[PDB]
């Protein structure tokens, strides 16, 4: 249990639907990291409030997206809107497995048990599960864990599993074949299951 590998940067960000396109285009330009750094801090293309938060967000989309295909980023930028969102959701699940676990432990259980919606403390119930299993998961302020959950919920809202953040009505979502194939390519078919846990 490495905390950073389990959590990713969920505490800080959700799908990052906007900033991820900018960081995608920049990565395919194969820039010197002189030029790539000035684009982020000096030029400040992410619209951030500080030099370090500009880097924080850039770090996160890089760890999420760069290690996948250099061909991945091409289809990412080339995709339809919901394929773009699905592919971002796919890379979120890879980079923050907590979201995958949350979907198995909570959404699937909700759909298999015929509950039409999640409850407001679904995330915290789930997170307590995880702290019992790995005690270092609870070395955070409550607000951190809540922000982490809000980021998880927004991702599930954004990618179509939940009607909205407030009522959290479970809705069906299907994988597009193009994102299936990237899961087979990445050798992560275990997640096909996860991304259809609401059917």
UniProtKB/TrEMBL annotation:
It comes from the Bacteria. Gene3D superfamilies: uncharacterized protein from magnetospirillum magneticum domain. The lineage of its organism: Bacteria, Pseudomonadati, Pseudomonadota, Gammaproteobacteria, Enterobacterales. This is DUF1819 family protein. It comes from Escherichia fergusonii (strain ATCC 35469 / DSM 13698 / CCUG 18766 / IAM 14443 / JCM 21226 / LMG 7866 / NBRC 102419 / NCTC 12128 / CDC 0568-73). InterPro entries: BrxA, BrxA_sf. Keywords: Plasmid.
